[PDB]
Design an enzyme around this catalytic site. Structure first.
Site, mmCIF file in Angstrom:
data_model
loop_
_atom_site.group_PDB
_atom_site.id
_atom_site.type_symbol
_atom_site.label_atom_id
_atom_site.label_comp_id
_atom_site.label_asym_id
_atom_site.label_seq_id
_atom_site.Cartn_x
_atom_site.Cartn_y
_atom_site.Cartn_z
ATOM 1 N N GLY A 1 0.819 -1.200 0.000
ATOM 2 C CA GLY A 1 0.000 0.000 0.000
ATOM 3 C C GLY A 1 0.851 1.246 0.000
ATOM 4 O O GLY A 1 0.565 2.195 0.709
ATOM 5 N N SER B 1 1.558 3.590 -2.346
ATOM 6 C CA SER B 1 1.417 4.550 -3.428
ATOM 7 C C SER B 1 1.227 5.983 -2.896
ATOM 8 O O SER B 1 1.642 6.945 -3.542
ATOM 9 C CB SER B 1 0.290 4.132 -4.383
ATOM 10 O OG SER B 1 -0.931 4.490 -3.828
ATOM 11 N N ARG B 2 0.630 6.129 -1.726
ATOM 12 C CA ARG B 2 0.480 7.456 -1.136
ATOM 13 C C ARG B 2 0.522 7.421 0.405
ATOM 14 O O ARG B 2 0.616 6.349 1.044
ATOM 15 C CB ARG B 2 -0.799 8.112 -1.648
ATOM 16 C CG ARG B 2 -2.012 7.196 -1.517
ATOM 17 C CD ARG B 2 -3.342 7.911 -1.414
ATOM 18 N NE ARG B 2 -4.392 6.880 -1.442
ATOM 19 C CZ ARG B 2 -4.695 6.051 -0.430
ATOM 20 N NH1 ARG B 2 -4.063 6.128 0.751
ATOM 21 N NH2 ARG B 2 -5.647 5.127 -0.599
ATOM 22 N N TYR C 1 -13.045 0.886 13.903
ATOM 23 C CA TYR C 1 -11.646 1.281 14.051
ATOM 24 C C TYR C 1 -10.965 0.365 15.066
ATOM 25 O O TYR C 1 -10.019 -0.343 14.728
ATOM 26 C CB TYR C 1 -11.502 2.764 14.468
ATOM 27 C CG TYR C 1 -10.148 3.069 15.063
ATOM 28 C CD1 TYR C 1 -8.999 3.099 14.266
ATOM 29 C CD2 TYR C 1 -9.997 3.286 16.437
ATOM 30 C CE1 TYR C 1 -7.737 3.348 14.818
ATOM 31 C CE2 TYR C 1 -8.744 3.539 16.989
ATOM 32 C CZ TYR C 1 -7.625 3.561 16.175
ATOM 33 O OH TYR C 1 -6.384 3.806 16.732
ATOM 34 N N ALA D 1 -10.606 -3.426 14.297
ATOM 35 C CA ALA D 1 -9.509 -3.675 13.353
ATOM 36 C C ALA D 1 -8.120 -3.571 14.011
ATOM 37 O O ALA D 1 -7.271 -4.412 13.803
ATOM 38 C CB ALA D 1 -9.608 -2.703 12.183
#
Lengths: 224, 218, 225, 219
Positions: free
Chosen positions: B15, B17-18, B132, B135
């Site tokens: 993950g 990319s940003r 939240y 997870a």
């Protein structure tokens, strides 16, 4: 060293208590390698001198009795006068011991009460500057340390000061089948090195740990 | 210098990319790692290659497909050598699934880490702002179990748990900032620092830990 | 075996010529120290005998050090099963007059004892240097006397990427093979070495603790010079 | 905890053990099971050595230039711990220091050679006058090794390169130091101790007359 701006403590004044051997020394040396101006403390002048010798141009040793306000005050004034205000404080001093009342107060004064006093005393300038680091090294009566870190952190967070605990596990100190028994509680299957305690303290001391506060960072091989 | 130096380490950052993922990939690269960052698409992979340059590359990965995981690891191993550092970055069904990727990717890179008796796995929980917390708790539970099981073979497994970090996702800002004792949002670079520290040779005796990067929010 | 001192756990060690004597002694000790060991012999039955004494700590493989295809196929199989080679011990050789051998016989002797060192070393270096961690140890007493020169050159070139390259140079060592009296007269210590003493030296140089030793010839010869 | 590199039952005399390389040497020989006696010039320096060694040995005051002090230090070691098995000599000014190496060595050699078992290790200094001093030590090592080899004693030199110490710790003189080291870093005292310890072990019995360089490819 600190040939780069990453984890670079150049311009920082670091007061490390109990720096003459083991963890304290390892802490003082690495903060110095990272460019900190380091003042390590010992109980005696000869202990202070030995700290000066290994620090060289990167700092010096001073005699401090962590249980006496006058000594704290005189040590801070001398640091401020020569090096500037304390930016990083590492509370590492302590002694590891039925006992008499006076002997136990002495153990509380050295291992917990000193943390309160030293912290309060360096916080004046940290909070005026809005920049500071306090790191409490605590794995006897050191169990109260975590509670204190979390309370002080919540109070000073908004003025740019962080307060954290590094909690060592079994670390190889200067001190046959009791080692076998020690190593059986560590999932990693080895003792820690003092240098590994220093790394953690140094990371938390850095500009890059500015958003970490109130944390207990355990360095114990999974002992958890 | 030799301090926090990841030269010779192969780091797989998912993950990337940003935001946090990108900030992580960049810093591991700055510290000398050979970095492979992942995105879901090839064009996303290409944009990761562009910002990594000679310090690594981008690859398309679908974290929910074993064949893709297997093919991505083989390509990394073939070109760069075995993965040394793995950074798992990026509603019940959504938690169950993402959680499942962490298990599969971890298990797959662990083979070689444990043969080598050297490895780092870092699980980045999600940025603040029930679901939240659910997870985060799922990730932390997995970290602690896997750490206990692999600790003796020189691999560490840790969680970095961000607070409120300035991203694309995140006036309601005033209300956000009121829960942070430090009185500001974090920067993705502050997440990357923590991951990088835990990725280093110097964090070899830290395992099973949740390192919170949240301005005292806890 | 049980501490972090001289501990090679997680290391992959390729030892050439490991079927007997020094090679075998080297392979065994690296294994005792926790290395995953692959020893080589010229034949499959020689390979098998190496597997038998290594057990769960590694295995034997047939290698012909003079053929690129065999080197390549042996490295691929090691990498596939065990991971990249971390420690390489070049011990292979035949010890046999130059003026009465044929051209082809002598090239074979150079290929085996010197040229193989170059090829094997180059081939394992790819991954060592990518990893910034490696050990190459050349066991040679006057393979050929060209070994020391080659160690010093390769060491200077790869030092900065965390790889060390050293020579261990044995003296007279008790092998399977008066004239012994005359041998012993040249050794100030007054005895032959044991293969285990060559293995100790190689193992020390192979360890994380020898990371700042490179370009060295460590003589294990009872005071010869 | 294994038989490999195990110095249990060995008595090791390490001179100049109060800091840096000397201290690193003394500590590791102790970790390996040696009974260690480190020396300093003063009693307070001796006491500080005792403090870090604990039950694994002690500190003693030695003046390496005085035969009476050498004799009295050896007697006290022999009386309490048994005969010296391993001696680590860890130091114009070259002539004199060289002389201490000869005297200490000669004095411990009596018993090593009667026992047919011993180790002497000479630590040259850390990287002109440098090279003159190294060469003196190396020349003594090679001569003494030849003479005592047949009686089971080894004599070797460990020659450090640039090691991170008090002495070598401006910003661009370090840069210039590091440029001569192919490895691109300074050594750690612990890496000197490793080498000394290897040479001190039962497993280095067939190494003698050697200069083992610990310098990152510098030469």
């Amino acid at each position: 060293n600190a040939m780069s701006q990453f984890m670079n403590l150049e311009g920082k004044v670091a007061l490390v208590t109990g720096a003459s051997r083991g963890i304290g020394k390892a802490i003082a040396e690495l903060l110095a390698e990272r460019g900190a101006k380091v003042i390590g403390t010992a109980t005696s002048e000869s202990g202070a001198q030995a700290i000066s010798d290994y620090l060289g141009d990167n700092g010096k040793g001073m005699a401090l009795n962590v249980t006496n306000p006058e000594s704290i005050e005189a040590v801070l004034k001398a640091i401020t006068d020569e090096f500037g205000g304390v930016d990083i404080l590492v509370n590492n001093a302590g002694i590891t011991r039925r006992m008499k009342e006076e002997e136990w107060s002495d153990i509380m004064e050295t291992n917990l009460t000193s943390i309160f006093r030293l912290s309060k005393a360096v916080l004046r300038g940290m909070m005026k500057k809005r920049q500071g680091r306090i790191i409490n090294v605590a794995s006897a009566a050191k169990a109260g340390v975590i509670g204190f870190t979390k309370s002080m952190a919540r109070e000073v967070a908004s003025r740019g000061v962080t307060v954290n605990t590094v909690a060592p596990g079994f670390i190889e100190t200067d001190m046959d089948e009791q080692r076998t028994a020690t190593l059986a509680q560590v999932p990693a299957g080895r003792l820690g090195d003092p240098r590994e305690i220093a790394s953690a303290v140094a990371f938390l001391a850095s500009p890059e740990a500015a958003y970490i506060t109130g944390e207990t960072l355990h360095v114990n091989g999974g002992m958890y």
